[PDB]
Amino acid sequence: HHPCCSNPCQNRGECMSTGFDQYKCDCTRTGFYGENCTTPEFLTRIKLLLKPTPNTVHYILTHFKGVWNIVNNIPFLRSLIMKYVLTSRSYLIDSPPTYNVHYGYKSWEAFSNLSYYTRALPPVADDCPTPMGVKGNKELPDSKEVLEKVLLRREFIPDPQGSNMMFAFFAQHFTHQFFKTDHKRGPGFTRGLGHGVDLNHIYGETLDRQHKLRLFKDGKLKYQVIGGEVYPPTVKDTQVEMIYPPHIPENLQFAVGQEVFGLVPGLMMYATIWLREHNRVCDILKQEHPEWGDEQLFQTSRLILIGETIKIVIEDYVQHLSGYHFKLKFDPELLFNQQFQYQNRIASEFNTLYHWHPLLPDTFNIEDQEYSFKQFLYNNSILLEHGLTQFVESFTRQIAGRVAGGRNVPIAVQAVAKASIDQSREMKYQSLNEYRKRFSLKPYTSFEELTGEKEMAAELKALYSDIDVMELYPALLVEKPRPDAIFGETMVELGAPFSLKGLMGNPICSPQYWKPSTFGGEVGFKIINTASIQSLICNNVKGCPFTSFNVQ
Amino acid sequence: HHPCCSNPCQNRGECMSTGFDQYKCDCTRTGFYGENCTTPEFLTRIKLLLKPTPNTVHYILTHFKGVWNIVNNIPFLRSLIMKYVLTSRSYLIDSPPTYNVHYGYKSWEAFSNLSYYTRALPPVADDCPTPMGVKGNKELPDSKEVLEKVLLRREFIPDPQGSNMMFAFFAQHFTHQFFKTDHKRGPGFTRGLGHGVDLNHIYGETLDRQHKLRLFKDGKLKYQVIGGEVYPPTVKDTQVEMIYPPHIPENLQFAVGQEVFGLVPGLMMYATIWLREHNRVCDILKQEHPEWGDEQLFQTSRLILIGETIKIVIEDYVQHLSGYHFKLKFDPELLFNQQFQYQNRIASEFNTLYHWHPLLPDTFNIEDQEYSFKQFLYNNSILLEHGLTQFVESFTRQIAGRVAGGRNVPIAVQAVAKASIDQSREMKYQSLNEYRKRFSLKPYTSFEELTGEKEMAAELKALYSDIDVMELYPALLVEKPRPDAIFGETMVELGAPFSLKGLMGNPICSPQYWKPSTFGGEVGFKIINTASIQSLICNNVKGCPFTSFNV
């Protein structure tokens, strides 16, 4: 078998076979040397001693509110801290990207083929004696068993950070522009060839789809007006293909950028909000530029909405998730004097960590009604009956489920959660602890250490036998959460670098793009730099209801 | 008309309409301010005062040979100078890329759509009163008249730098991996979706084409043996589509990565040389790694050949072109502490400036034979008849033509030269002087200043009227060359920044790729770092004939 099966090379050292039973580690620029890149250079040894743990940093960022209240209001200090936040997390992602599901070594095919999700860790070789390499049993434990014992919801566990349904549905809507698995090809392939925040979920992945969605007047997107309210246009009207069961009435077959968004009225709520936002921005730009044609109006609005999206994701969405007292800032200028690659490739493991199905409640509570999953799925009449104002008011008040902590996946989506495990194994994912080391985390030494608890830990111990073969995905959902937090350490420390790269890597954040003229002048630039989840709703939802990402 | 038609914004300021007849200049980060971004900030004043001209820098690099001989043998100083060369060129190219033929403003379509060549300068708006904006006449001069008067060869003018046919065909073979105009869509579109040095011209643009070209044994490419010599396989054998005239016999239809390389036996020479090199590298890697399968042998060999290519282009090819006494270095590590984007998008203007058709001789001289264009084109019999050794020997001896200085385009390719002009206009290219300003060069104040001469200048004046509407492409071919040089200032100062990006931007140059293990270990890595045009020919051509890009 492949001599690199045991993952012998440490500290980002790269393993290469040198014969049938021999390997070599390439310790280039790791700061380590020796056979397995485990002997530190002198300068490295000092860095390890001085470097605080992620849990220490988290404590600092989530306490001392009085000090942070000062920091947040001194623009120079806020910028400095944010510059550190950005740069401390940038160096962890290979960019240009490296591995994929089919390539455990660098290749032009893995680099150039945009149809693959990239990989933070190479896959376990095909001929390895065990699934995780050389450790553990010949087979991993039954996935249905892992699911049932440590993942499935017994009783609803609310998120102690107060994440609501506005947050949960924003998470789903936003990420589904860049997690678009091409199931025809396999779980390691994507349909989102832009590999990031291009807003294809609004505009369509292809030019063909985009042009079917466009009005070709005033830069705008096509729409319909039902009971005086603006909604996306129909499949019939546009000839835009969507996923709908046959029994859905023509009028409720809404056509949007992303073909799966009719699945859930919560997704269609945001699809509608963003459609309205695009047309609103077209109006503003038309007022600024009566001389502009439809094409420039459309394209400039798209760039503005991309900017709005990144602004909101950083300052509201990630801000909420983090639990930080420090106020995160979207400011591309923070990177202009730094080394940073303005490019991104979506990582398979980023997809996997983002399977936050515990967020989902047992019922979807809108106005006085409580809808089951079966009543909610593919049911856009709910959206029409209640309207966007009530959707916002209800979803703002309804708490979401805790993701870490174990036993909180609703049974309605048990098959989805089982698929995350099954596809991970199919894609030959390395273990949790290999991923922990990859992102500069200390490997867990027991199951009890992972869960911070005894019962699930014992179940997992009997299932997996060795902590070193525990799998990434289920570990994320059973991990001991940070104090009163939605996530444990592994989720934050893997998710943050992937996220940073997707957000700041966007070409609009690059110096040649980050200019008023790119966005139609100061007015368009202003729309980006003042965007918030609240203003998004305020501008595009009747009555400007209050909203936020927490129930509070 | 569009208020930005006059190109009012200077020093990289972006122009935006603010009404039907008003514009505004966005002067962000230009180091200038005011209505047209022409008032320099204080730091900029000092920078401009201390900045040497490209002509001055060129003088220093092409003189003081003895000092450069010393400098070349001190690794720290060579690295420091090469680093400067790389970083001074870098800031000139938009990366991520911005404009294209259809987009004079930044847009997601322009950024994301890889089918377009990018544009260093936005197209002139469709409604502008004149082709160049507002200056000049309603129509540009007849492209035939421009061609006949100042571009077409009378007497053959040899390149004073001594460029040979090895160089001329290398230029053609190398660049045609990334200049692959999609003529079905238009001149602003490309089929080279990798936008750089990916060696699709050897391996094929698509996976389907690559798989037809591969042996699937030992990582190797399919090949045939003719008279004991290795050549590319046939169209009939691979089912790989190639562009050939119908009369070309099946045995003479070689199948290689790039569809058009059957056009010219000089191209098929390099196609054969590089095919052999791939298979040679496969042999070496199999010795290093008996445990590896076909897929990894193939992929790692491709990576090594990409490295060899960049190595040769910098240290032999650009080295020869530059005329520098300073020895250029291929070293990715020079950029590791620098701000640099490991990405590239091929510019239309880079394509345009690289139409070096004056390089071509009147006849192609192989051994005792002199082949006209008619006899040479599409004639791979010539390659088989003489063999690669005689091709190398002959092409190394034969001098190429001077590109700048005017009147050196061979008649045989007059329609191609006329197309470069016509397609520039179709693509709504801004003027020569606009491109000079875009690249920190002083606008020419007269046609005499451009040519360094009187006869052609007076013909151009009669044709164009105003120096500020002189077109880019004809300008490059008539420009006063540097002393005893192949090119004028405009060619080098536009070409070098596009070139640097395409070469150093390659992902193999990034810190996570630039490691021995990427290339199968130290042996594979050394193949790259010791590559040369001479070694390429020595290892792959019977008899190891001597070669270089000069003489």
Ligand code: COH
């Ligand atoms: C971010 C949180 C989140 C939420 C709240 C959520 C809410 C819901 C929900 C009810 C609202 C239902 C019925 C489902 C059901 C599914 N989810 Co999500 N999903 C979420 C994150 C994801 C992600 C990420 C994927 C992978 C998408 C991919 O790879 O294409 C996913 C995939 C799926 C899939 C299969 C992949 C596909 O292409 O569709 C189903 C079925 N699901 N999920």
Ligand code: COH
């Ligand atoms: C690098 C120097 C070089 C050389 C030595 C060379 C040698 C030769 C040669 C004799 C061997 C012949 C018969 C041709 C003939 C042609 N060349 Co060149 N070409 C060269 C640089 C280019 C470039 C660059 C293009 C544009 C390629 C594209 O856009 O696809 C080109 C395009 C062409 C075209 C397409 C015309 C158009 O519309 O662009 C023809 C025909 N030609 N060329």
Ligand SMILES: *[C@@H]1O[C@H](CO)[C@@H](O[C@@H]2O[C@H](CO)[C@@H](O[C@@H]3O[C@H](CO)[C@@H](O)[C@H](O)[C@@H]3O)[C@H](O)[C@H]2NC(C)=O)[C@H](O)[C@H]1NC(C)=O
């Ligand atoms: C990016 O990578 C994927 C995965 O390798 C590529 O898709 C694959 O493409 C090949 C060749 O085009 C397909 O192979 C087959 O060829 C023959 C037809 O001659 C036939 O026997 C098979 O039915 C099939 O067509 C292969 O199916 C396909 N693999 C998939 C879909 O997983 C893709 O082409 C690459 N993208 C680019 C731009 O290169």
Ligand SMILES: *[C@@H]1O[C@@H](CO)[C@@H](O[C@@H]2O[C@H](CO)[C@@H](O)[C@H](O)[C@H]2NC(C)=O)[C@H](O)[C@H]1NC(C)=O
């Ligand atoms: C670096 O590599 C590892 C291999 O993972 C180690 O080899 C192992 O040493 C173990 C002792 O703790 C043995 O029990 C085990 O048999 C052995 N594995 C194999 C397959 O050789 C090397 O000793 C280590 N080298 C250094 C220099 O630290």
Ligand SMILES: *[C@@H]1O[C@H](CO)[C@@H](O[C@@H]2O[C@H](CO)[C@@H](O)[C@H](O)[C@H]2NC(C)=O)[C@H](O)[C@H]1NC(C)=O
């Ligand atoms: C990149 O741009 C080109 C040109 O706009 C697109 O090609 C056109 O696509 C439309 C809609 O599919 C076709 O109707 C036209 O025939 C094409 N125009 C041509 C040939 O010039 C191309 O689709 C774009 N690429 C992507 C991936 O969106």
Ligand SMILES: *[C@@H]1O[C@H](CO)[C@@H](O[C@@H]2O[C@H](CO)[C@@H](O)[C@H](O)[C@H]2NC(C)=O)[C@H](O)[C@H]1NC(C)=O
């Ligand atoms: C900025 O540029 C504009 C346009 O080039 C200048 O306006 C022109 O100036 C000339 C001479 O001053 C006049 O002949 C014309 O009235 C204008 N030209 C055009 C195209 O209409 C303006 O002077 C510049 N502004 C500054 C502050 O220097």
Ligand SMILES: CCCCC/C=C\C/C=C\C/C=C\C/C=C\CCCC(=O)OC[C@@H](O)CO
């Ligand atoms: C492309 C965006 C993806 C969605 C982003 C949201 C979550 C990412 C997924 C998992 C990570 C879990 C929590 C992230 C929130 C806070 C963690 C700290 C944020 C940080 O350090 O900077 C954050 C810094 O990177 C922001 O720039």
Ligand SMILES: CCCCC/C=C\C/C=C\C/C=C\C/C=C\CCCC(=O)OC[C@@H](O)CO
């Ligand atoms: C798209 C892929 C581009 C690969 C490059 C291929 C061809 C480009 C070669 C020449 C372009 C035309 C003129 C420049 C040539 C020589 C001038 C000197 C070069 C220099 O000073 O910097 C040298 C410094 O820039 C070295 O990088």
Ligand SMILES: CCCCCCCCO[C@@H]1O[C@H](CO)[C@@H](O)[C@H](O)[C@H]1O
């Ligand atoms: C949705 C509820 C899960 C049903 C599947 C039961 C599979 C066995 O799972 C068991 O469930 C018990 C009850 O929570 C726990 O006490 C045990 O620790 C657990 O192993």
Ligand SMILES: *[C@@H]1O[C@H](CO)[C@@H](O)[C@H](O)[C@H]1NC(C)=O
């Ligand atoms: C869909 O929602 C409506 C409320 O708008 C509800 O009355 C109906 O029963 C639901 N339909 C299905 C098929 O669940």
Ligand SMILES: *[C@@H]1O[C@H](CO)[C@@H](O)[C@H](O)[C@H]1NC(C)=O
């Ligand atoms: C092709 O080259 C051969 C020499 O190998 C020559 O004799 C012949 O005339 C050429 N063919 C044509 C049609 O020009």
